[PDB]
């Protein structure tokens, strides 16, 4: 599987066997992500939230054709150690899926 | 039909008979029946309409020992495209089949618009 993240953790990704790339702007993140979508290989791409909060919104026209690629957003290296509540992400997820806001 | 029968069974012709609109014949029959206060059939038509139509259709056929033949192609209009109307019902009870045209096939430019299932 591939993962777009900060350059610091890219060496650790390469050590663990993960395909890591280092980038800091949304433009290159989206272009590289759709390049990973079109290219043959692993179908899973992991995204740091600092570059692209919703990768499905980036590939929404490639997602309408095929739903086999898998995308996963996660906190970046700086956001990881300072931390946050993941339950806000859960509330946003359920509010997106149903269209309804409940169970804070 | 008198002329057709004479030609076919006395002069050995092969006669094809076309009747343009049996609906108008049924309308005239209903006029005469309603003038005489007859007992109606289902909608308006008199109760004896089955027998009267039978004397028209059943004059076709072929006869043993003769070369002639009579074939009939009546044409009639189902009023609201309705197969359960009395005139198509009695016609389908008397005749030997039917060819049913379809309006949906006609709207698509298909000619002839014959619907094969009914």
């Amino acid at each position: 599987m591939a993962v777009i993240a900060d350059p610091e953790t890219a060496q650790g990704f390469r050590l663990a066997g993960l395909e890591g790339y280092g980038a800091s702007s949304a433009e290159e993140a989206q272009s590289l992500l759709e390049t990973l979508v079109e290219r043959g290989g692993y179908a899973l791409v992991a995204v740091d939230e600092a570059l692209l909060p919703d990768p499905e919104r980036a590939v929404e026209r490639l997602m309408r054709g095929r739903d086999l690629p898998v995308l996963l957003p996660i906190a970046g290296l700086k956001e990881a150690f300072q931390g946050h509540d993941v339950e806000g992400y859960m509330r946003e997820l359920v509010r997106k899926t149903i269209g309804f806001d409940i169970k804070l | 039909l008198t002329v057709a029968e004479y030609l076919a069974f006395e002069h050995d012709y092969h006669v094809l008979v076309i009747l343009t609109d049996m609906t108008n014949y049924c309308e005239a029959l209903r006029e005469i029946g309603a003038a005489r206060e007859e007992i109606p059939g289902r909608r308006g038509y008199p109760g004896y309409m089955y027998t009267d139509l039978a004397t028209i259709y059943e004059r076709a056929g072929v006869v043993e020992g003769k070369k002639g033949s009579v074939t009939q192609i009546p044409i009639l209009s189902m009023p609201d495209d309705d197969r359960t109307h009395p005139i198509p019902d009695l016609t389908g009870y008397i005749t030997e089949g039917q060819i049913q045209l379809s309006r949906e096939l006609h709207r698509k430019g298909i000619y002839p618009p014959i619907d094969p299932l009914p």
């Binding site: 906190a75 931390g83 993941v86 992400y89 859960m90 997820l93 359920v94 | 359960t84």
Partner: protein
């Protein structure tokens, strides 16, 4: 559609079928709601474990 008594009976049967189908689909939606709640709880737990 030609109005007959048999047609009226068929239409009323269709109406009863439609109402029963609506009720059955509501029950199915209820079951899906329960499964959705369980799955979202599991997903939240997995997300925080992944963060740690």
């Amino acid at each position: 559609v030609s109005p007959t008594r048999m047609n009226l009976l068929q239409r009323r049967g269709q109406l009863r079928l439609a109402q029963k189908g609506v009720d059955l689909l509501k029950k199915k939606r209820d079951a899906l709601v329960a499964e959705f709640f369980g799955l979202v709880r599991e997903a939240m737990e997995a997300r925080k474990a992944l963060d740690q």
